[PDB]
Symmetry: D2
Subunit: 201 residues, 4 copies
């Protein structure tokens, strides 16, 4: 198949007590898996349309592709963006840390803007730290669902899933507590990797 | 300023008779300029938000940034994607042509799928030929407005502005004629360049 | 058929010089007509799905229905909301005028809020004065496309089409001039009728 | 205040075993309350905007109003649409039942179409049985979030909250089981009342 479900780089319960193993298992095995199948199906349907020379359902297929592929992209990044508490540095450093200070003033200011974007979403969405290739800078974006509210070419560096399934079982309606706990499991080494590959554009 | 308006790589009337100089001038000098100014203002407001620790309008600012920056990105690609007819090849060749044949079966099939995506939009939008870095392939996407219906990391190769301001003065409601004419002014050299640089590899 | 294209209550050129006959004809005969067909088709497809017990394309059909039916609703209201310059009162009076003063302070304040909503849309949309049955009041809403950014149960009293096809041929990018000219052709007697039937909820 | 939180017509645990009291309490006391407060704040800000003639955040305020008011409207209908099993009929009858048979063929067909719309949503949303005043019929709509994918004038008769917070704690990702259970607690008397009052006639 064109798309495959990547395995978590850690145990389902490795992110506790910040994110429960219950959520991690349901989130990965159920949710992420669905996006993989949906993205594969969307492409299969588009190829079928081309062969039959009938693009009557093009609007449906393009949304199915964007929604599912974006869901696949976002979650793939999400898993690697995290790691067990004491496994990685608690703060960005080197070029990444410098870039954060340059475009946000400081690490704390970056977190403040990112958190505000994360808890204020009206509906399902994501908070994301991205590399803007045009302006050559790091910005924060607030995705709607998986595929809305973002410029083409945006390269994800750090993403936080704000869909209710990502936190409801543990934090219920208190989104602030979820975001607060999540910072404790962010793998800044992975974010640095994504920044290095993004900046080399 | 963070963002700046790029100059057109040709005269306003250089795309005639396929795209009028009347449209090109309004589209570039007025529309694109507004996106650049809006994107800069969004960043200024976000910086101000970080300074005072007041992210009350974070939802507004994130959409303002996504909408304007996406408009700036989309139009910047749009201008270079075109050139006066004759000054550029009529069909894709080499690696680009081979990739189009691989992911769409043929140039005509890609053209048909892209056209369908362009004319079927329910609202303002774009038809876009992008490089999918996760699936390592070329796909077509149907953007809504400027910043909706697309996965993060999507790299634009060829885009067509389907907002009514891009064709109404000349083609009125007949969007189908607009798309047909547009193919004649596509600069496949520019598309090939973008494809070669997609996900630095 | 379930839906039909209503005729304009006046000549195509009756709204000049505020809105050209060229626009009125294209807008009514081309655009509005498309929504009627699309809404009829959406329902036909849904009935076909029910008979076959296959709702695989339910997401597509529900969007097709909402988009097209909303387009039909919005335009139907739009036409009747207007009349040749000196044919109707230039200001709301009686219960309608009183209600406007009550929920906006004055007629001018209502226009200011309505205009701001009309010219600020990021993409296609509408500015609409509606009757909120729950709060029992008149509010202004900014529709996105035709079917987005509005609560269920909202009863349209006065609507302004801000899609580019509604003004580009005459006012180009200058949206402010279009809205300004449009106020001169608003049929307040029709708005009063819609208010009377809405308030009787 | 303009908007107020309505009390539930039954105890939080009255919908068990179909819908948990745990969900009902959080959903009502926390979620619905937030929409009421948000809708009131939106109106306050709009009034403030009119006072100072500063509509700079008009796009934000119009979305805040649409999102919150739609959430308030949707949930107000949602609560009354349900009642403990047994306390209300298991199937629609009289005029309502006849209308459902007319516009869907049968109660089972309406149920199947509604279910499909409920489980297939790409993001947060609602499945809604509404009265179409233009077509003079009963249709099903698939709302996105609270305020998207619906025509103006749509009158809610029966709605199902498909936001993850409405079922995750009990049904996890199995939205299909949530919908099946939900049918058991539908108060057809309330739906019949809403149908009788749809477009005062
Ligand atoms: Fe998720
Ligand atoms: Fe444009
Ligand atoms: Fe229109
Ligand atoms: Fe809810």
């Amino acid at each position: 198949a064109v798309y495959t479900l990547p395995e978590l780089p850690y145990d389902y319960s490795a992110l506790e007590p910040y994110i429960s193993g219950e959520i991690m298992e349901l989130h990965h095995d159920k949710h992420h898996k669905a996006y993989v199948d949906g993205a594969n199906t969307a492409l299969d349907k588009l190829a079928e349309a081309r062969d039959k020379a009938d693009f009557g359902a093009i609007n449906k297929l393009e949304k199915d592709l964007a929604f599912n592929l974006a869901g696949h992209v976002n979650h793939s990044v999400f898993w690697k963006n995290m790691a067990p508490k004491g496994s990685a540095p608690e703060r960005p450093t080197d070029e990444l840390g410098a870039a954060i200070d340059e475009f946000f003033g400081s690490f704390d200011n970056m977190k403040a803007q990112f958190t505000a974007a994360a808890t204020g979403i009206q509906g399902s969405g994501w908070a994301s730290l991205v590399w803007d290739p045009l302006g050559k800078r790091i910005n924060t974006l607030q995705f709607y669902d998986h595929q809305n509210n973002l410029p083409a070419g945006s390269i994800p560096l750090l993403q936080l899933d704000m869909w209710e399934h990502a936190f409801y079982l543990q934090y219920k309606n208190v989104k602030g507590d979820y975001v607060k706990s999540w910072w404790n499991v962010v793998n800044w080494d992975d974010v640095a990797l994504r920044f290095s590959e993004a900046r080399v554009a």
